[PDB]
Amino acid sequence: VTLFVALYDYEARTEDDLSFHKGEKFQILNSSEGDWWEARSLTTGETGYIPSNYVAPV
C-alpha cells in the first residue's frame, strides 16, 4: 500500500500534472525518484503526475 497526502496545495499548470489542495489523498503507483511522481486521485479517479516533494507517506 502507498497512500500519500498533499502537504500543500498545487495548481496543475500542464495537461500532465494534477491539481488539488493540501489534505487530498493520492495513490503513488510509479515514483522512481526524479521530481514528478504518478499518483491517482482517489476523489476524482483521474491519474496524473504530482510533485513528489508535495506528497508524503501517511
UniProtKB/Swiss-Prot annotation:
Residue limits of the SH3 domain? 1-58
Where is this chain's protein located in or outside the cell? Answer: Cytoplasm; Nucleus; Cell membrane; Perikaryon
Which tissues and organs express this gene's product? Isoform 1 is highly expressed in the brain. Isoform 2 is expressed in cells of hemopoietic lineages, especially T-lymphocytes.
Q: How is it modified after translation?
A: Phosphorylated at tyrosine residues, which can be enhanced by NTN1.
Which family is this sequence assigned to? Belongs to the protein kinase superfamily. Tyr protein kinase family. SRC subfamily.
Report the protein's function: Non-receptor tyrosine-protein kinase that plays a role in many biological processes including regulation of cell growth and survival, cell adhesion, integrin-mediated signaling, cytoskeletal remodeling, cell motility, immune response and axon guidance. Inactive FYN is phosphorylated on its C-terminal tail within the catalytic domain. Following activation by PKA, the protein subsequently associates with PTK2/FAK1, allowing PTK2/FAK1 phosphorylation, activation and targeting to focal adhesions.
According to the record's subunit comment, the protein's assembly and interactions are: Interacts (via its SH3 domain) with PIK3R1 and PRMT8. Interacts with FYB1, PAG1, and SH2D1A. Interacts with CD79A (tyrosine-phosphorylated form); the interaction increases FYN activity. Interacts (via SH2 domain) with CSF1R (tyrosine phosphorylated). Interacts with TOM1L1 (phosphorylated form). Interacts with KDR (tyrosine phosphorylated). Interacts (via SH3 domain) with KLHL2 (via N-terminus). Interacts with SH2D1A and SLAMF1. Interacts with ITCH; the interaction phosphorylates ITCH and negatively regulates its activity. Interacts with FASLG. Interacts with RUNX3. Interacts with KIT. (Microbial infection) Interacts (via its SH3 domain) with hepatitis E virus/HEV protein ORF3.
- Tell me the protein's name: Tyrosine-protein kinase Fyn
The record's gene field reads FYN
